[PDB]
């Protein structure tokens, strides 16, 4: 997250860190046994870390659970990034508490202008690299699809939504992928892609979760 | 994503690590220093 702020410790209880030796992507806990992330975050072996604030310090609120099942959306395109969503079934149900909680799926698609909260441990710099120890937060609005299209000519599908600022300055960045975009208590987006970070005319592009509620629910029930 | 990969640094004359996002990789991107030097080491 570039241009954000350090989240209040454990104030984003649904935020998880996907780890395979090091933190490499974010994710969101949707039920005590399932996490939703980005398909481009796929790895054959993934450890889910919940209740994290400082990913480099054992604070005492963490829960480490391995991914038993990793299911990418069947229509995920690794080039266009269309359908960039993935589900992870945990090897064991996590213990829910004030610091490890679930986030609700969308009741319907949120319109442009809706204010949301983006979070993650991704790079905090537009130029150069700085990997934060502490979870970063960013309040940003869902942008009109026309503006998203104008910023990314011919690259935006209805399964994508731009969130951020056309003037740049604040945005998600490498390492935030798979993380949450929560608006009014509902997971409306998943950190996916973009050109650079916090650059003018190139706000981040996110997977539009409201288009996948049926797939998510069907997949969980079948696995 | 934050994926650690290797690239050949021509100025340094050796392969170093960098952060690859996980998609649309160019060719100066390897999973190991050995594969990187084998391909780009010259000679």
């Amino acid at each position: 997250i570039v241009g954000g702020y350090t989240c209040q410790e454990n104030s984003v209880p649904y935020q998880v860190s996907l780890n395979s030796g090091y933190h490499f992507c974010g994710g969101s806990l949707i039920n005590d046994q399932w996490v939703v992330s980005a398909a481009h975050c796929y790895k054959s072996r993934i450890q889910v870390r919940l209740g994290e604030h400082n990913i480099n310090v054992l604070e005492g609120n963490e829960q480490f659970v391995n991914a038993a099942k990793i299911i990418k959306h069947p229509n995920f395109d690794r080039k266009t990034l269309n359908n960039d969503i993935m589900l992870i079934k945990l090897s064991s149900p996590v213990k829910l508490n004030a610091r490890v909680a679930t986030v609700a799926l969308p009741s319907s698609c949120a319109p442009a202008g809706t204010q949301c909260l983006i979070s993650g441990w991704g790079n905090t710099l537009s130029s150069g690299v700085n990997e934060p120890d502490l979870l970063q937060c960013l309040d940003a609005p869902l942008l009109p699809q026309a503006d998203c299209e104008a910023s990314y000519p011919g690259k935006i599908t209805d399964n994508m939504v731009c969130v951020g600022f056309l003037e740049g300055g604040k945005d998600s960045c490498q390492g935030d992928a798979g993380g949450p975009v929560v608006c009014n208590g509902e997971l409306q987006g998943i950190v996916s892609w973009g050109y650079g970070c916090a650059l003018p005319d190139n706000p981040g592009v996110y997977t539009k979760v409201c288009n996948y509620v049926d797939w998510i629910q069907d997949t969980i029930a079948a696995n | 994503a934050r994926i650690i990969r290797y690239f050949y640094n021509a100025k340094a004359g050796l392969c170093q690590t960098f952060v690859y996002g996980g998609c649309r990789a160019k060719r100066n991107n390897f999973k190991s220093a050995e594969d990187c030097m084998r391909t780009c080491g010259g000679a």
């Binding site: 980005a38 990034l81 973009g194 050109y195 | 690859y20 649309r24 100066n28």
Partner: peptide, 15 residues
Amino acid sequence: RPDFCLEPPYTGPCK
């Protein structure tokens, strides 16, 4: 050596 070896490392669009 191959031309691509002389290009700067490319992070790409995935964030």
